[PDB]
Amino acid sequence: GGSTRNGRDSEAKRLGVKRFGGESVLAGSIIVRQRGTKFHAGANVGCGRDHTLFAKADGKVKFEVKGPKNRKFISIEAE
Amino acid sequence: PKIKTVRGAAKRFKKTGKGGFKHKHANLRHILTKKATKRKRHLRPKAMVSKGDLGLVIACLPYA
Amino acid sequence: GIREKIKLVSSAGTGHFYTTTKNKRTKPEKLELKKFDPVVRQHVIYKEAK
Amino acid sequence: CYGGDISRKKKLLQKQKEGKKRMKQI
Amino acid sequence: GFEGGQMPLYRRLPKFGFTSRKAAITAEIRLSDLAKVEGGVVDLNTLKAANIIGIQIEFAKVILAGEVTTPVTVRGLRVTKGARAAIEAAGGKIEE
RNA sequence: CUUUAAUGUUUGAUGUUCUAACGUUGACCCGUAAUCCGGGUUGCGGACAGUGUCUGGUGGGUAGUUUGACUGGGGCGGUCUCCUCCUAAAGAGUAACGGAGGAGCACGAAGGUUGGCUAAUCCUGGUCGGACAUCAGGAGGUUAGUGCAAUGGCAUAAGCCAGCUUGACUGCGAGCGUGACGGCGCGAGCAGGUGCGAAAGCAGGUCAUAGUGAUCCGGUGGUUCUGAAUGGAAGGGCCAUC
RNA sequence: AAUUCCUUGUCGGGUAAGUUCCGACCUGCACGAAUGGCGUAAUGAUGGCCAGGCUGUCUCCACCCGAGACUCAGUGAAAUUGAACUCGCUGUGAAGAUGCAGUGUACCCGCGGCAAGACGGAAAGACCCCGUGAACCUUUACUAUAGCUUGACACUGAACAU
RNA sequence: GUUUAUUAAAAACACAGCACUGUGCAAACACGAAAGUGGACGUAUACGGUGUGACGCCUGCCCGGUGCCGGAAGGUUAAUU
RNA sequence: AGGACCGAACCGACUAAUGUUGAAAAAUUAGCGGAUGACUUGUGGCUGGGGGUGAAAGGCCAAUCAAACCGGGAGAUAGCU
RNA sequence: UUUUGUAUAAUGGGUCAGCGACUUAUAUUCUGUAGCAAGGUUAACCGAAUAGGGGAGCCGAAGGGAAACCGAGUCUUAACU
Numbered sequence: 001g002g003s004t005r006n007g008r009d010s011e012a013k014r015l016g017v018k019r020f021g022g023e024s025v026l027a028g029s030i031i032v033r034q035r036g037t038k039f040h041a042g043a044n045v046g047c048g049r050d051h052t053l054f055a056k057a058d059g060k061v062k063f064e065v066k067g068p069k070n071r072k073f074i075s076i077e078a079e
Numbered sequence: 080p081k082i083k084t085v086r087g088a089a090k091r092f093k094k095t096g097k098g099g100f101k102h103k104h105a106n107l108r109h110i111l112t113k114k115a116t117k118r119k120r121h122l123r124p125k126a127m128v129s130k131g132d133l134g135l136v137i138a139c140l141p142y143a
Numbered sequence: 144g145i146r147e148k149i150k151l152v153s154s155a156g157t158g159h160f161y162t163t164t165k166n167k168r169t170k171p172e173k174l175e176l177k178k179f180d181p182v183v184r185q186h187v188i189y190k191e192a193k
Numbered sequence: 194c195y196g197g198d199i200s201r202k203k204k205l206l207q208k209q210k211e212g213k214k215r216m217k218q219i
Numbered sequence: 220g221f222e223g224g225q226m227p228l229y230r231r232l233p234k235f236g237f238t239s240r241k242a243a244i245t246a247e248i249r250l251s252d253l254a255k256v257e258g259g260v261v262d263l264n265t266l267k268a269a270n271i272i273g274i275q276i277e278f279a280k281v282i283l284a285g286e287v288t289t290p291v292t293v294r295g296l297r298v299t300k301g302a303r304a305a306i307e308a309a310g311g312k313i314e315e
Numbered sequence: 316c317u318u319u320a321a322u323g324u325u326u327g328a329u330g331u332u333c334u335a336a337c338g339u340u341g342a343c344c345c346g347u348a349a350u351c352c353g354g355g356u357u358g359c360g361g362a363c364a365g366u367g368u369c370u371g372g373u374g375g376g377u378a379g380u381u382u383g384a385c386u387g388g389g390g391c392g393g394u395c396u397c398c399u400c401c402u403a404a405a406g407a408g409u410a411a412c413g414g415a416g417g418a419g420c421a422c423g424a425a426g427g428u429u430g431g432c433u434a435a436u437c438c439u440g441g442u443c444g445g446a447c448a449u450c451a452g453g454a455g456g457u458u459a460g461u462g463c464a465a466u467g468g469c470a471u472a473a474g475c476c477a478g479c480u481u482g483a484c485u486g487c488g489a490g491c492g493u494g495a496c497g498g499c500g501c502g503a504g505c506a507g508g509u510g511c512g513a514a515a516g517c518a519g520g521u522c523a524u525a526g527u528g529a530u531c532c533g534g535u536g537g538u539u540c541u542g543a544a545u546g547g548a549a550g551g552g553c554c555a556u557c
Numbered sequence: 558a559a560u561u562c563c564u565u566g567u568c569g570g571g572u573a574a575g576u577u578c579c580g581a582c583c584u585g586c587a588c589g590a591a592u593g594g595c596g597u598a599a600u601g602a603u604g605g606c607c608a609g610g611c612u613g614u615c616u617c618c619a620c621c622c623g624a625g626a627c628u629c630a631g632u633g634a635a636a637u638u639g640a641a642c643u644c645g646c647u648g649u650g651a652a653g654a655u656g657c658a659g660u661g662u663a664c665c666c667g668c669g670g671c672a673a674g675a676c677g678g679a680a681a682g683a684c685c686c687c688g689u690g691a692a693c694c695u696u697u698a699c700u701a702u703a704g705c706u707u708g709a710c711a712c713u714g715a716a717c718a719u
Numbered sequence: 720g721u722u723u724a725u726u727a728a729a730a731a732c733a734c735a736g737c738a739c740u741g742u743g744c745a746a747a748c749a750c751g752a753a754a755g756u757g758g759a760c761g762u763a764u765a766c767g768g769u770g771u772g773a774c775g776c777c778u779g780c781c782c783g784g785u786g787c788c789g790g791a792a793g794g795u796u797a798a799u800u
Numbered sequence: 801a802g803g804a805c806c807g808a809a810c811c812g813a814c815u816a817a818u819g820u821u822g823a824a825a826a827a828u829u830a831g832c833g834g835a836u837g838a839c840u841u842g843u844g845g846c847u848g849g850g851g852g853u854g855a856a857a858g859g860c861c862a863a864u865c866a867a868a869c870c871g872g873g874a875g876a877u878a879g880c881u
Numbered sequence: 882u883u884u885u886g887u888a889u890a891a892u893g894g895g896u897c898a899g900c901g902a903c904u905u906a907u908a909u910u911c912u913g914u915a916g917c918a919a920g921g922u923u924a925a926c927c928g929a930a931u932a933g934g935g936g937a938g939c940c941g942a943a944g945g946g947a948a949a950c951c952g953a954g955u956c957u958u959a960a961c962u
Contacts, residue, residue, distance in 0.1 A: 024490045033467040033523045048501050050523055080907050088229040090236045102232045112162040139220050141909050158537045181485045186509050212563025230530055231497050237552045237947050299952055
């Protein structure tokens with residue numbers, strides 16, 4: 001036995017999403033250990049040190065698909 | 080007779096212009112070297128007490 | 144564990160100091176590096192243990 | 194008595210067997 | 220202030236106190252006064268006889284609380300710039 | 316300085332004797348037709364003993380208490396915080412003495428940046444040298460690698476090597492995220508000054524998540540803030556910190 | 558064996574048959590020499606086992622004599638008690654029914670009786686966990702402490718000596 | 720012989736005997752802030768405490784652990800200066 | 801001669817029967833043990849509640865003892881009923 | 882009554898009549914109401930006494946800052962866009 005024990009939250013999930021207001025610098029998609037589950041693309045650079053994403057300007061969130069080998073690349077419609 | 084202020088509370092709170100109380104942050108007293116600089120820089124400024132805890136400070140300091 | 148804690152005194156006459164950590168078992172050499180000094184508002188060399 | 198505890202019983206059966214290991218070979 | 224055996228909110232938070240002592244003896248006036256000072260000359264006292272300040276006090280300040288009309292001679296008080304111009308609007312003397 | 320002898324001297328230790336302090340539950344006298352007590356004569360003892368204040372040791376002889384929770388009844392065993400995966404039902408979250416495993420750090424470079432680099436494994440040739448050292452060649456395409464457990468990551472490489480380096484900076488920070496709270500997490504940008512690059516631009520620590528401690532109490536360093544009649548000091552504040 | 562768990566240890570005696578008894582072996586789970594070892598005539602309202610005698614202990618109860626119980630006269634209580642117009646079986650149900658459903662039986666009420674029930678009456682436990690409950694008791698639980706000792710100064714002096 | 724009066728009379732307690740150990744007398748010790756008193760109007764053939772428990776044959780080995788006892792060097796040490 | 805012997809009064813308490821809202825808040829009936837002694841008893845005396853006393857069971861101290869009875873702190877406190 | 886749950890075979894009451902459980906004081910906050918309103922208010926006490934006197938004081942009218950200080954601003958900072 002002794003196989004108990006557990007971690008906790010580490011909330012890691014999309015938050016700012018789709019037609020999100022995308023105000024200023026909200027943490028749209030906060031997934032930990034990311035920079036792979038999603039990527040930079042639009043006016044936002046995102047890329048927190050722990051791969052947290054965030055808007056860099058007001059606008060719609062986008063979720064695209066881009067370069068070779070598919071991938072995700074979150075971006076932002078400008079406004 | 081007169082209600083007595085919980086003197087520990089008197090030394091840890093101070094009413095402002097609209098019935099708030101503010102309080103100095105925790106984690107600013109020792110073992111500082113292992114903490115990030117940014118954290119400490121965000122702990123120095125005073126901060127107002129939380130909405131959910133305000134009723135306690137209200138109930139502890141009648142003469143606040 | 145083993146790794147030590149250390150002061151970083153400014154060469155400048157002001158009393159400012161950074162704080163740091165390093166082993167005694169590993170590298171003997173005492174630290175030398177410049178860093179910004181707020182009282183002087185200028186980068187200046189820092190060294191020393193204790 | 195029986196009580197229902199597990200270790201409280203296997204000690205007894207252990208004694209009962211441990212004697213038989215001697216008494217057999219003798 | 221009790222809340223289970225959890226360490227209480229007025230104990231988690233570090234002390235930052237320091238009474239000034241001096242602060243106890245520095246009351247401040249408002250411009251709506253000294254139309255009532257009577258005699259036309261304000262002082263660290265006088266008002267103290269007008270009971271708009273208190274007895275123990277030494278230092279005092281004017282502060283622009285607003286509305287002064289009749290001329291008044293400020294004297295022996297520290298005063299804010301807005302209050303200074305305010306007393307000037309009354310044509311009030313402002314001596315040190 | 317020096318090894319230090321001596322007469323000047325300073326105060327100290329034990330040792331002997333002396334008696335006038337002090338003891339006498341030795342003897343006689345009286346108070347007194349009285350074994351208490353006191354005075355008197357006298358024997359012994361003696362500055363020892365005993366009592367006081369302070370002080371080290373010893374002390375269940377006596378006293379006041381403490382001796383955890385979860386718990387498949389309690390005891391015993393076992394765990395108690397922190398990270399990763401499952402259970403967990405395609406938002407988040409979600410329990411069990413449910414299934415697997417880790418941490419109480421490591422590093423001034425394993426940090427910054429500029430330029431450059433491409434793995435394992437397998438096959439054949441080839442000196443000692445072989446199943447497996449280094450070489451060449453071909454397949455193979457990340458089946459490799461990351462300071463460390465496990466997921467998510469990673470070719471613009473976050474993987475490896477080198478040049479120069481201290482941004483592992485100081486003062487703030489629109490916003491959010493996450494919590495009952497105490498808090499924790501992200502972050503453009505701005506101001507100072509600093510490093511790489513020709514320049515664009517990058518850097519407010521490590522690929523990411525574990526590597527931890529509230530308040531009180533104090534110790535150090537800076538600080539005209541306060542300084543109980545004034546002036547200083549004493550602490551106390553304040554920033555930095557153990 | 559007052560010690561032996563396994564144990565109804567193995568062998569002998571005693572009994573028609575002996576988990577106890579008496580005798581011996583040693584494989585003494587875990588006897589042992591002043592928290593004494595091994596012996597012991599006498600002594601025991603002591604522990605266990607045997608035998609003669611004797612008996613209603615028993616197979617198996619039987620009859621009789623006295624005091625109660627029973628009937629009559631006079632006094633006359635008690636534990637208990639929500640209220641009752643207070644049945645059996647089968648089943649459901651807070652999970653072991655006089656009360657509910659279904660079914661069966663059952664004219665109204667005493668007296669002597671017997672104790673299966675009314676989770677019958679009597680002790681708000683003698684057991685268990687809990688309570689940051691008390692009590693006492695133990696020790697190398699913590700902090701004190703009476704007492705016993707330690708040294709300084711005080712009551713406390715004089716000469717002399719290395 | 721004695722014990723749990725009011726569920727336990729014993730294989731418990733006591734005992735003479737043995738041993739250790741303390742105490743030289745103003746004893747050790749005990750009751751007491753102290754005075755005093757018991758010990759005892761007694762004195763090591765006496766008195767306290769502890770263990771064992773007539774008599775008979777006996778009473779093994781270990782002083783590391785714990786206490787007690789005996790040690791004039793040394794290390795460490797409070798009050799005071 | 802004797803903590804000798806059998807056994808009444810005298811003290812004791814082993815067995816069984818009753819009794820169990822009893823006659824009795826510990827007794828009766830039939831037996832049993834000690835009975836010249838470490839006996840039995842009348843009368844007064846003293847030891848005091850964290851103390852007494854104890855041929856030691858944690859027993860006994862006014863029908864109650866792992867800390868008596870009465871009064872005071874006292875409306876102790878009670879996360880419990 | 883207590884429980885997830887009781888005709889429960891879970892606790893409590895034999896019945897009737899009486900007594901029997903959210904108060905008192907000083908503070909503090911909110912609400913309701915009435916008085917005056919940028920001001921509101923008296924406390925001890927004097928007193929022909931529920932009058933009247935008594936503004937010492939309390940509260941509101943300006944805050945920010947640890948603090949000096951500053952003040953419709955202020956603190957933070959060499960400095961705020």
